[PDB]
Amino acid sequence: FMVSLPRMVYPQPKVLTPCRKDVLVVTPWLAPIVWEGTFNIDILNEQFRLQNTTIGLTVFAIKKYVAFLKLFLETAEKHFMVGHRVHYYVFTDQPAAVPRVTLGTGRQLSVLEVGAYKQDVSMRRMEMISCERRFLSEVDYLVCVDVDMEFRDHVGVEILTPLFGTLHPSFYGSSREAFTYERRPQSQAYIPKDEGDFYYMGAFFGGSVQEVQRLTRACHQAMMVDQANGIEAVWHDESHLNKYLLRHKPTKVLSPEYLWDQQLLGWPAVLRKLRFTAVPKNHQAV
Ligand SMILES: O=c1ccn([C@@H]2O[C@H](COP(=O)(O)OP(=O)(O)O)[C@@H](O)[C@H]2O)c(=O)[nH]1
Ligand SMILES: [Mn+2]
């Protein structure tokens, strides 16, 4: 049950004036595409706070990637779901290397020890996430992100919905034939050249606990079939994520404001804010 919103004073939405004319703000299956200017955060804050919403954030920090945690967590404190209940789940092979980061009120962090794989690290996240009964008891939504990242601007309850994906910053302008989907029919992740809505980033997806568990279970199962079939998808977990979200349409899609790389891609006109961004790294070294 959901109580009434309080009286609120804000600018009237204008039916004959779009918020944004430069971008698509709704998908053909009527899911919002979340861009700056499309949402009144005060209204959304009210709605989610009235439900006493708790947001779980999962992050894997395996082997050298423990180095990324301090910046990741400190910036999350400044920008991620501020004012709402947050539970961070940090999956790591080195619990002692987790930095002591000061948390605001209503926010907690749990350290979950896991093994370290020698592609496998990235891929096993789906399995590791799918944990099941615990998330259901502790949080309302789960957000699953990469750790080699920092928050630079607001990432809030505007993202929350049963199931979301994020537009990959390199491909939001690309035609579907150019998308780097798995193209081999022998893989569970296979998507033909005439199919595909968007290319979603593996580094930021989420939803209700129920929908995230479904997604992660399905992707884990598909990866297992592939392994038994001697095939590994071209972009690993991301390829499977893309297949899942093709066949199970997300109820919101996050714009590339939510997963950006400024070093690689700059700051184009279509982006009013850079919210959650790649931290430069030496890939093979790290
Ligand atoms: O040695 C590793 C490699 C990967 N990861 C995790 O898997 C995610 C995805 O890998 P990475 O960020 O290297 O992929 P990219 O964004 O460069 O495609 C990382 O953010 C970490 O959360 C990790 O913890 N340790
Ligand atoms: Mn990454």
UniProtKB/Swiss-Prot annotation:
A cellular component term, taken from the record's GO annotations: Golgi membrane
Effect recorded for D226N: In allele B104
Catalytic activity: an alpha-L-fucosyl-(1->2)-beta-D-galactosyl derivative + UDP-N-acetyl-alpha-D-galactosamine = an N-acetyl-alpha-D-galactosaminyl-(1->3)-[alpha-L-fucosyl-(1->2)]-beta-D-galactosyl derivative + UDP + H(+); an alpha-L-fucosyl-(1->2)-beta-D-galactosyl derivative + UDP-alpha-D-galactose = an alpha-D-galactosyl-(1->3)-[alpha-L-fucosyl-(1->2)]-beta-D-galactosyl derivative + UDP + H(+)
Subcellular location: Golgi apparatus, Golgi stack membrane; Secreted
GO molecular function: antigen binding; fucosylgalactoside 3-alpha-galactosyltransferase activity; glycoprotein-fucosylgalactoside alpha-N-acetylgalactosaminyltransferase activity; manganese ion binding; nucleotide binding
Record keyword DNA repair present: no
Active site: E238
Post-translational events: The soluble form derives from the membrane form by proteolytic processing.
Gene Ontology biological process terms from the UniProt entry: carbohydrate metabolic process; lipid glycosylation; protein glycosylation
Cofactor(s) named in the record: Mn(2+)
Alphabetical UniProt keywords: Blood group antigen, Glycoprotein, Glycosyltransferase, Golgi apparatus, Manganese, Membrane, Metal-binding, Secreted, Signal-anchor, Transferase, Transmembrane, Transmembrane helix
Binding site for UDP-N-acetyl-alpha-D-galactosamine: F60, A61, I62, Y65, D146, V147, D148
First-level EC class: transferase
Binding residue positions for an alpha-L-fucosyl-(1->2)-beta-D-galactosyl derivative: H168, T180, E238, D261
Residues on Lumenal side: 3-286
Binding annotation for Mn(2+): D146, D148
Effect of G165R: In group B transferase; lower-level protein expression and intracellular cytoplasmic mislocation
Top-level lineage group: Eukaryota
Domain notes: The conserved DXD motif is involved in cofactor binding. The manganese ion interacts with the beta-phosphate group of UDP and may also have a role in catalysis.
Function, as annotated: This protein is the basis of the ABO blood group system. The histo-blood group ABO involves three carbohydrate antigens: A, B, and H. A, B, and AB individuals express a glycosyltransferase activity that converts the H antigen to the A antigen (by addition of UDP-GalNAc) or to the B antigen (by addition of UDP-Gal), whereas O individuals lack such activity.
Official protein name in the record: Histo-blood group ABO system transferase
UniProt source species: Homo sapiens (Human)
Section covered of the full-length record: 64 to 351 of 354
